[PDB]
């Protein structure tokens, strides 16, 4: 008799789960959940004992535009007040290190305009704005068709991307960074792998992978920034499997294939080295998945800004070198913290008896604090002292006594970001 009762329970739970799927796979529901779940995922991988802080500001993309369009200028925007005015520009306050926007951007003119404003804001506050790209940005339904794209460079030649192309040429683009595919936040509910109480719920992911709780990669990138700071109080160690751009401990999900077993990739796709490089060339931050593991990595953090080409001469190549350093976030983060230290520490010196050469003397002794100019300092030292050389010149503002014009130029240690190898067999080689 009980066997039939058990069958009733089976069919009951079957029906209940069918309904439960609808709520859990609801786009509104997932928006809410992924927001807060992704937030904690960020929060609990930081260390608040290392002088890390984070604030939440509830804002939709639509009302960001509302505010930016409403205000007469960016200096009177509500966000500017929260970021710049109440922080960086306030005596006794503190400056916002970076802004993480939980958004997906398309090529739509509204999205483009929003990025323009965020670039301006970041430039003024000296803090980068990080967010993510939607699948449709690449003309595809989801990120699972990235392997079918034959050539992104050529794709972006379409009239469709006119505004985006102009955006990449702006001097404010250095403060924008957008990430590519999303990543899993939650393993599907399962009697064994992820059980719930009472109700025998087994979550049924359909053919649509949008049933999976995908999360915004920007948060992963954000934890990279935090770790670097937690260890060194600087943020350049965010672009390598070993350097600190590795994302460890991703969710896994083994399920039946064509009679075999396979795990849902933590990122929508398994990005190849060539595909990753292509995305890098187009200014995207692609989190790549280490095949067969639960680890992913950010191989580089190029900003939105497109590098300028100069004439092939000693001077022209130096110009290229300089400009490219500007286009990459691992170096801009150095500048950003320097800006923040200068703003704070100099306000303390206002009203002191300083002549022109007094500033040169003091500013020199100060910047040396972060310089490691040894023949071969170890990577740990190089991390905590990101600069190799620095130069400071101070001039007078003529016709305005007590005011000065200061120039600060720095040479950071270089990151290893690629190489070409030529292999050759040879006889009569000099013996090593």
């Amino acid at each position: 008799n009980k066997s039939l009762v058990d069958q009733m329970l089976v069919e009951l739970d079957k029906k209940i789960s069918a309904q439960m799927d609808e709520i859990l796979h609801n786009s509104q529901f997932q928006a809410m959940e992924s927001a807060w779940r992704g937030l904690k995922l960020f929060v609990d991988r930081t260390d608040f004992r290392e002088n890390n802080k984070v604030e939440i500001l509830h804002v939709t993309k639509d009302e960001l535009l509302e505010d930016f369009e409403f205000a007469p200028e960016t200096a009177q925007s509500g966000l500017y007040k929260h970021v710049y005015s109440a922080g960086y520009g306030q005596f006794g306050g503190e400056p916002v290190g970076a802004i993480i926007g939980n958004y997906a951007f398309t090529p739509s003119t509204p999205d483009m305009k929003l990025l323009q404003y965020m670039g301006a804001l970041g430039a003024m506050a000296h803090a980068p704005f990080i967010s993510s790209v939607g699948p449709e940005f690449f003309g595809i339904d989801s990120f699972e068709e990235l392997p079918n794209i034959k050539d992104l460079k050529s794709t972006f030649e379409s009239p469709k991307y006119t505004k985006w192309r102009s955006l990449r040429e702006s001097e404010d683009a250095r403060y924008l960074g957008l990430t590519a595919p999303r990543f899993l936040l939650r393993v599907p509910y399962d009697p064994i792998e992820n059980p719930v109480k009472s109700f025998n719920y087994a979550e049924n992911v359909s053919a649509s992978h949008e049933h999976y709780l995908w999360g915004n990669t920007a948060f992963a990138f954000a934890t990279r920034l935090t770790d670097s700071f937690a260890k060194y109080r600087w943020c350049p160690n965010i672009i390598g499997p070993q350097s600190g751009g590795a994302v460890e401990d991703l969710p896994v999900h083994v399920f039946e294939s064509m009679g075999a077993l396979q795990s849902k990739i933590p990122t929508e796709v398994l990005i190849t080295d060539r595909k990753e490089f292509e995305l890098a060339e187009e200014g995207f931050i692609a989190l790549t998945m280490r095949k067969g593991s639960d680890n992913a990595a950010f191989f580089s953090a190029n900003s939105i800004q497109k590098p300028k080409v100069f004439p092939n001469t000693k001077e022209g190549k130096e110009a290229e070198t300089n400009y490219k350093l500007g286009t990459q976030l691992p170096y801009m983060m150095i500048i950003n913290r320097l800006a923040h230290y200068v703003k704070v520490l100099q306000r303390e010196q206002i009203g002191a008896w300083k002549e022109r050469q007094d500033l040169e003397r003091e500013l020199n002794s100060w910047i040396k604090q972060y310089v490691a100019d040894q023949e071969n300092p170890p990577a740990d030292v190089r991390s905590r002292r990101p600069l190799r050389a620095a130069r400071i010149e101070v001039m007078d503002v003529e016709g305005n006594p007590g005011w000065y014009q200061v120039s600060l130029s720095v040479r950071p240690h270089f990151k290893y970001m690629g190489a070409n190898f030529e292999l050759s067999l040879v006889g009569r080689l000099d013996q090593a």
Binding site: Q19, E22, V54, I56, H58, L79, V96, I100, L345
Partner: protein, 125 residues
């Protein structure tokens, strides 16, 4: 006052002075990030410049959710029957991340809660 107090001048005056030379003391700056996003199910009437930011850390994350007050009013296909015109409207409330578990979802949806109650009754056989 951070000046340091001394007694009125006498023939012999003794004062402790810390030998910091001319070194300029400095203040360590935190790394503060600002997470901006749609954390509620609706837009606020309060202007952006007026709504405030919330400091979050490991020791108060759940408290922050509770205080933020989350709510979802949404309609899903009603699959507890065999009618394409049947729709189910729910009003979910969240205080912590635990409230996004199916267990909580069922408890806040009578159409499922009663079926769970039924399940337990059947199990009690």
């Amino acid at each position: 006052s951070k000046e340091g107090s001394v007694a009125p001048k006498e023939r012999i005056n003794i004062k402790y002075i810390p030998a910091t030379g001319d070194a300029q003391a400095e203040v360590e700056l935190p790394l503060k990030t600002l997470v901006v996003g749609d954390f509620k199910g609706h837009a606020e009437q309060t202007p952006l410049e007026e709504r405030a930011t919330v400091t979050v850390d490991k020791n108060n994350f759940e408290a922050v959710m509770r205080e933020s007050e989350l709510k979802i009013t949404a309609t899903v296909k009603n699959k507890l029957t065999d009618d394409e015109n049947a729709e189910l409207p729910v009003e979910l409330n969240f205080k912590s991340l635990a409230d996004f578990a199916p267990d909580a979802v069922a408890s806040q949806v009578p159409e499922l809660k009663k079926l769970i109650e039924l399940r337990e009754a059947l199990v009690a056989l």
